[PDB]
Amino acid sequence: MFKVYGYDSNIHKCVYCDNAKRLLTVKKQPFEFINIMPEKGVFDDEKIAELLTKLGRDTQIGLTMPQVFAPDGSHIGGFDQLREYFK
């Protein structure tokens, strides 16, 4: 299943979050959303922590959301980046 790290609407807004969700549905793939910001204060270091490790072993200065991850456990990217995953 695909894993998306971004916003929904209750805590934070997101226009590209909905668009992408449609992309998958169009391809017929199992996936689920995950709110990286469970609190209006700060994102969830728990999910954000494992995320950082998911990509590699460095840092991301300005990483945008939502961040998706392949079922097997890999960094796919956003829409365009993921579109490549689909093709």
UniProtKB/Swiss-Prot annotation:
Belongs to the glutaredoxin family. It comes from the Viruses. One of its GO terms (biological process) is deoxyribonucleotide biosynthetic process. Changing P66A: 30% loss of ability to be reduced by thioredoxin reductase. The gene is NRDC. The disulfide bond functions as an electron carrier in the synthesis of deoxyribonucleotides from the corresponding ribonucleotide. Changing V15G: Almost no effect. Keywords: Deoxyribonucleotide synthesis, Disulfide bond, Electron transport, NADP, Redox-active center, Transport. The lineage of its organism: Viruses, Duplodnaviria, Heunggongvirae, Uroviricota, Caudoviricetes. This is Glutaredoxin. PROSITE patterns: GLUTAREDOXIN_1, GLUTAREDOXIN_2.
